[PDB]
Amino acid sequence: NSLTEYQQLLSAWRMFLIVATHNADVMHLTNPEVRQKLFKDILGGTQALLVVPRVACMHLSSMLCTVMIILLRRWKNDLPEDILNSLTQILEGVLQRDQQLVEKTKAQIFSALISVLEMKPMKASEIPQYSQLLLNVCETLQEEVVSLVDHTRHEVQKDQRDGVCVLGLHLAKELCEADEEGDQWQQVLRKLPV
């Protein structure tokens, strides 16, 4: 019953932090400690909100996602394992979701994970559930790719499908670049006629 109130207040905190990061000096938003606190809090908030199985949580997490994306882009130089595990569980929930509403969330979580890996070059051994991570990446890639295939074939919404496609492509490219031996990649390609 307090829904609309918390929603508007979150819109307020959002717009506030946005106008802040755009002019951090005027806001005195130079503190990288505060920058990291904000980033982590907004991330975890998107997480907990996107964890509830049973429409409001969707829109809320989507706003939080747009925010976290712009924020990470601006504060990258101020911006990991626990973040990896968290974005993993988050993408997991985003997978157990109905597709027609989870697309933007998948794209966001993907760019987030990409930033998490680009933040520090890591080998597959330091990536928790790296097997499961690549597994899910492959599942999503397969599904969305077949989808975009059918969509392009029926064309005998143009740019977004290709955008997500190229996105997952570069994602898997980096994931494989993390696995030089391909043994896990081998088990994967053996499991999937990608």
């Binding site: 946005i18 996602c65 747009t66 925010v67 994306i69 712009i70 924020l71 990470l72 882009r73 601006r74 794209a107 966001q108 760019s111 990409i114 930033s115 680009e118 955008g163 190229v166 996105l167 570069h170 490219k173 980096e174």
Partner: protein
């Protein structure tokens, strides 16, 4: 929509990173082949 800006930025960042790594590998291939040609030559 700062979000879309952020995302396109990260995507183009990945694309440039890969293109640069690719060109670097290609130059490494060319130069290594060159030293090889020099030795066998």
């Amino acid at each position: 929509d700062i979000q879309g800006f952020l995302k396109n930025e990260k995507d183009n960042a990945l694309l440039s990173a890969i293109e640069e790594s690719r060109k670097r590998t290609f130059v490494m291939a060319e130069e290594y082949h060159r030293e090889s040609m020099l030795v066998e030559w």
